[PDB]
Design a protein around this ligand. Structure first.
Ligand code: KX7
Ligand code: CA
Lengths: 153, 478, 88, 233, 51
């Protein structure tokens, strides 16, 4: 699990900072930095496909133009009031990230879990019935009544 | 042979001709008879005329006889001259072995094989036993080589170099029988080197670690540990002796039987060096230098610096990027200059094989995209060049962040999994081949059935490649 | 479904092979980091550029008996190991 | 010249290991040839393998009438090429007249053996008395004279092998006729140069050998595993 | 007979690979061969081994 979280955090930071830097310009709010660098590439692990990279399904009714209300900043505009970001550099970036996390990195964790289960099972019953000693001793140690009456004793 | 020896011996004239009896018992394989009734009475040994019979035993593959001769006395360095080696490598050297040596020199070149090609070029036109051992070993003699190997001094280096030569000559594709025998003999000598060094370590650690580091006055011009590396002999290094040597060289001054959290805690709090929390087994300024010299803490300081560098790069790129560089961009250029100096130092001290490593390739690539980002970034008052500079820095940040994986391979826990991660690329490429075939087939069929004569290339590739690609993450084309 | 759950099976099989060789390959790779960190005599990373100038300072101005002793030591366990081979 | 088969190599290696474990001297001829060569090599090997813990003592006792290059000093010499062995940590060279005199050192050697065999040192397990074992493996006049000079004295503890020249003729028979029968059948190629007037003397030598068979013991052929030298001594 | 162990042995495998590469020797790398495939008049050079 910790190997998975290390690799996923590295890919998540790399994609999030690259996308936030390519799209927008000088975000000054820390909350909308961390909602766009950490949170949305995190949701792309459950199959969300990060949204504002397409330039044909991007509407300006979800912007702010300056940080005044809740919504994110716009992607930074042209002199023609057109989005500046290249689709040919952000569509394959999202595709490489989505391949790398949602398929390679999860199906590797499946393989490692299967290998660890395949090892530890012949030792597992031994470790369980070794742990059985501690519950047997903590339940045979006290001479006790029913639990909600123990306060009386 | 026994009938001929009983006839030759009882002539009563050549009972004094022990040379003739010895040549007769050498031409046949009579080992027991020659030992039992030539060398028994010790009534006449000269020790200097045994050279003709020695050369005869060498050229005819008589290993038990050369064992008996060395047991009863001969010095090989006294025996060997340059004329003997030219007679071996010139006349008694095969031609098919030389052809396999040519094919190996053409297709699978190496430093040791360049050395043995140079020495065989020398002798077909000063370490005697080692060259005779090379001669015996690349003929696949397999039993004369053991007899000479027991006589050598640098026996670990000899076994490792022989394993390297035979593993290279096993890669030649024609005459697969000789490749099989050379592979078996390679495995035998690498087994021999490992099993001898485990004894040399299981008696005395300090003298075994003295053995590991010596160059043998240009044996092949390299070292025991280096010859184990260059042959990819990873069982010689996965043994606990060399592992103990490496860990004792990794912690350095600090003893290995102290816990790691004390070490990193003394790393973060510097004037805590002068206390009784770390053990310096393996007055105060010596404690200071013995801590801040070791490889462990210079590595750990370096990774803390690198995480701070990545946070600075991210802050500059997302929150403070104006038409003129402010102060944290200038600190950023200073830190990238530090990284550039380190990498050009490592290129200078390695050479061309620096470029063999993939991480040094993408390392050079990241530095090049950084200076390209600078030369797009300094052209102010032009919006397109400034936005292009920031896009170049974002892709560069992707490279700099992905290098952190190769940084953290040294860990006892993460390490073997990151090394495991590169063994998966053939499954990934099989997946991508099959997925690309199905994706192209479905995309062209759907675009042809639905629409008619699309003329825009972008809306061809958004509808043939991109949407069937998104159907891998569960999108169900609409 | 078919093509992703096949990749899962192939990853699981490759992990099931390479793990007993994996620690050997890792501690073989350990040599390269140990040698690149024990090769240079160096200060803390962000100060290394200072030592770079010191190396520039260099370009501003410009048979052994114990080895025989340790080889002779090696020969004794060589003989002991050969005796052990022929003893087994 | 000297025939050393690997059994004798193992035996003498085990012997010098026993000498190192017990802290014992080894007396020998001290020349460079053959058996003294191999003993000196194994002395240097056990020295070079450990470098401490009671570095063993090898006394060589040479004749000085046979030494080739001789230097008179008070100042160290440098003897290079009888030739002396390199590895003996102590040498003693006896004095006499002309060159052509072997069997000269046997007098002082056996006199010293008698003196240690009567020397008292109560810090031991032999009841004091510093035990002495005499070993013979090859052959010659010097071997028979040494064994009879030892067994004529008390406390010799003579030990012989079962392979060699005179080791066979003492191992195998355990009067005049049997001695002649075994000596012509085990050493045929020396008797062609031997007059009978000293062959009867050699029969007297072996009779005085077998006078005391309790002070003699033997190493055999089935006894060829490990720790056979301790079992003999 | 679907006797696939008689063909999975190195002798018949060597026979099949020597019949598959044909004139070109087997101990040359594949990228030289495909590179000489794309550039036709490069056939006359010392990059492929016709042993
Ligand atoms: O030595 C190093 N060089 C660079 C580096 C230097 C310049 C450019 C790039 N790059 O573009 O990826 C990387 C990466 C980090 N790094 C490092 C730091 C601490 C521990 C281990 C390490 O390898
Ligand atoms: Ca590098």
């Amino acid at each position: 699990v910790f190997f998975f979280l290390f690799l996923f955090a590295v890919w998540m930071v790399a994609f999030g900072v690259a996308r936030q830097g390519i799209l927008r310009q000088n975000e000054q709010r820390w909350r909308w930095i961390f909602r766009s660098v950490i949170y949305e590439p995190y949701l792309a692990m459950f199959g969300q496909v990060p949204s504002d990279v397409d330039s044909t399904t991007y509407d300006f009714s979800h912007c702010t133009f300056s940080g005044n209300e809740s919504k994110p900043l716009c992607v930074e505009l042209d002199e023609h009031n057109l989005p500046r970001f290249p689709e040919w550099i952000t569509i394959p970036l999202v595709c490489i990230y989505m391949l790398s996390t949602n398929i390679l990195l999860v199906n590797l964790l499946v393989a490692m879990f299967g290998y660890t289960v395949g090892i530890v099972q012949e030792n597992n019953d031994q470790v369980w019935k070794f742990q059985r000693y501690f519950l047997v001793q903590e339940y045979c140690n006290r001479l006790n009544i029913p639990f909600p009456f123990v306060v009386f004793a | 042979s026994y009938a001929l020896y009983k006839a030759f011996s009882t002539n009563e004239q050549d009972k004094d001709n022990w040379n003739g009896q010895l040549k007769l018992l050498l031409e046949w394989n009579q080992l027991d008879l020659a030992s039992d009734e030539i060398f028994t009475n010790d009534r006449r040994w000269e020790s200097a005329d045994l050279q003709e019979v020695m050369f005869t035993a060498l050229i005819k593959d008589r290993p038990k006889f050369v064992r008996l001769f060395l047991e009863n006395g001969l010095n090989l360095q006294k025996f060997l001259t340059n004329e003997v080696l030219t007679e071996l490598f010139s006349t008694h050297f095969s031609t098919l072995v030389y052809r396999n040596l040519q094919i190996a020199k053409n297709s699978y070149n190496d430093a040791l094989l360049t050395f043995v090609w140079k020495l065989v070029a020398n002798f077909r036109r000063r370490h005697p036993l080692q060259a005779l051992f090379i001669w015996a070993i690349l003929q696949n003699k397999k039993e004369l080589s053991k007899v000479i190997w027991e006589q050598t001094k640098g026996c670990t280096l000899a076994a490792l170099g022989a394993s390297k030569l035979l593993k290279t000559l096993a890669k030649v594709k024609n005459d697969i029988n000789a490749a099989g025998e050379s592979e078996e003999l390679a495995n035998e000598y690498e087994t021999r080197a490992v099993e001898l060094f485990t004894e040399c370590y299981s008696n005395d650690e300090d003298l075994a670690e003295q053995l590991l580091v010596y160059s043998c006055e240009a044996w092949g011009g390299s070292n025991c540990l280096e010859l184990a590396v260059e042959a990819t002999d990873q069982h010689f290094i996965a043994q606990p002796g060399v592992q103990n040597f490496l860990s004792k060289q990794w912690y350095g001054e600090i003893s290995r039987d102290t816990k790691n959290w004390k070490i990193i805690l003394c790393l973060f709090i510097i004037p805590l060096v002068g206390c009784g929390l770390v053990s310096f087994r393996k007055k105060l300024l010596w404690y200071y230098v013995a801590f801040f010299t070791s490889p462990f803490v210079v590595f750990s300081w370096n990774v803390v610096f690198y995480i701070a560098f990545l946070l600075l790069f991210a802050y500059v790129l997302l929150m403070d990027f104006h038409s003129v560089p402010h102060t944290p961009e200038l600190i950023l250029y200073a830190l990238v200059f530090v990284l550039f100096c380190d990498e050009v130092r490592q290129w200078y001290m390695n050479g061309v094989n620096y470029f063999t490593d993939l991480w040094n390739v993408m390392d050079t690539l990241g530095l090049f995209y950084f200076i390209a980002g600078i030369v797009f970034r300094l052209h102010s008052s032009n919006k397109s060049s400034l936005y292009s500079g920031r896009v170049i820095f974002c892709l560069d940040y992707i490279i700099f962040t992905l290098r952190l994986i190769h940084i953290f391979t040294v860990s006892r826990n993460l390490g073997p999994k990151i090394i495991m991660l590169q063994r998966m690329l053939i499954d990934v490429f099989f997946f991508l081949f099959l997925f690309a075939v199905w994706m192209v087939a479905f995309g062209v069929a759907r675009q042809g059935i639905l629409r008619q004569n699309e003329q825009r290339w972008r809306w061809i590739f958004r509808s043939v490649i991109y949407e069937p690609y998104l159907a891998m993450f569960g999108q169900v084309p609409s | 479904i078919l093509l992703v759950n096949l990749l899962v099976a192939m990853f699981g099989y490759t992990v099931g092979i390479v793990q007993e060789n994996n620690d050997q390959v890792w501690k073989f790779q350990r040599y390269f980091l140990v040698q690149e960190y024990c090769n240079r005599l160096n200060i803390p990373f962000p100060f290394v550029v200072f030592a770079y100038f010191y190396m520039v300072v260099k370009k501003c101005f410009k048979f052994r008996n114990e080895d025989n002793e340790t080889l002779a030591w090696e020969g004794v366990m060589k003989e002991n190991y050969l005796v052990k081979i022929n003893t087994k | 010249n000297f025939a050393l088969k690997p059994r004798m190599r193992k035996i003498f290696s085990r012997l010098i290991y026993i000498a190192q474990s017990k802290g014992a001297w080894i007396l020998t001829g001290g020349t460079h040839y053959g058996l003294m060569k191999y003993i000196g090599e194994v002395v240097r090997d056990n020295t070079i393998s450990r470098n401490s813990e009671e570095n063993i003592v090898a006394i060589g006792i040479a004749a000085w009438g046979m030494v080739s290059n001789r230097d008179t000093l008070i100042d160290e010499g440098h003897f290079s090429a009888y030739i002396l062995d390199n590895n003996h940590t102590h040498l003693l060279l006896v004095d006499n007249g002309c060159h052509g005199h072997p069997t000269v050192e046997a007098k002082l050697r056996n006199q010293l053996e008698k003196y240690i065999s009567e020397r008292t040192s109560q810090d031991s397990n032999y009841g004091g008395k510093i035990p002495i074992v005499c070993f013979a493996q090859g052959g010659g006049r010097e071997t028979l004279k040494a064994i009879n000079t030892s067994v004529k004295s008390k406390i010799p503890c003579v030990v012989v092998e079962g392979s060699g020249q005179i080791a066979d003729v003492i191992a195998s028979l355990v009067t005049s006729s049997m001695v002649k029968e075994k000596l012509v059948r085990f050493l045929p190629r020396t008797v062609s140069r031997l007059p009978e007037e000293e062959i009867e003397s050699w029969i007297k030598w072996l009779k005085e050998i077998l006078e005391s068979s309790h002070l003699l013991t033997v190493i055999k052929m089935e006894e060829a595993g490990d720790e056979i030298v301790s079992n003999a001594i």
